[PDB]
């Protein structure tokens, strides 16, 4: 659904604390600026891609305590309140099966993992 949100300081990556490099870099124009627009535009899409999928409901619905569904056991997909993150067994198995300085920073997502499980 989404990718990792990233941003790159085009000046810091090329000119690593070198004012001589910066003065030369200014003669190339807005090449520095255009790159931050594209990555910023990518980052906004990863938040819309999550809203388009999970935020399909206008109000939150809760599971009742008396879980009588005619013999159907939804325990493995329903959230386990005993956990710190209110996720299901299957939601936990999927998370376990999956695994700097040069102007390179990683932005976090808008919706945290707990919010996704609520939807």
């Amino acid at each position: 659904v989404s990718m990792t949100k990233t941003s790159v300081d085009c000046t810091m990556y090329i000119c690593g604390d070198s004012t001589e490099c910066s003065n030369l870099l200014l003669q190339y124009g807005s090449f520095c600026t255009q790159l931050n627009r594209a990555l910023t535009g990518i980052a906004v899409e990863q938040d819309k891609n999550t809203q388009e999928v999970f935020a399909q409901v206008k109000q939150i619905y809760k599971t009742p305590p008396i879980k009588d569904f005619g013999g159907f056991n939804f325990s493995q997909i329903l959230p386990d309140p005993s956990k710190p993150s209110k996720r299901s067994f299957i939601e936990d198995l999927l998370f376990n099966k999956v695994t700097k300085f040069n102007g390179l920073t990683v932005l976090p997502p808008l919706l945290t993992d707990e919010m996704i499980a609520q939807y």
Partner: protein, 145 residues
Amino acid sequence: IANQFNSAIGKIQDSLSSTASALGKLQNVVNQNAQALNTLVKQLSSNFGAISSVLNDILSRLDPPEAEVQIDRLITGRLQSLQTYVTQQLIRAAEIRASANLAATKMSECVLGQSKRVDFCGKGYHLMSFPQSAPHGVVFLHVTY
């Protein structure tokens, strides 16, 4: 029908708790971004035809007018390394969007309703589907007759 449903649920835990290549679609997304970032950092050690990769070593060895020529080579190479990275991520961001618009379409047609579309909400006659979250993605459990 209830025993058949509960038994099929148990087989999923046996598969996901043992098989590693089941979630290859999501792992390839994580690995793709990591290689692009590491490749972007490794190109800083490249000279691009200069005496060295480090600016201070060029500044602490050569004169200004001789260094400004060689510094222009690192800038030309390092600047292309960004365009190669940003242009790739723009394409990777299109494949992920089409996959996201699909998942949004399946959450509406498969989960929020019953679909008569074949092989869209699972193999066989679709009854209902249950979603499950995951890192950078989503999982659909398609019940079929």
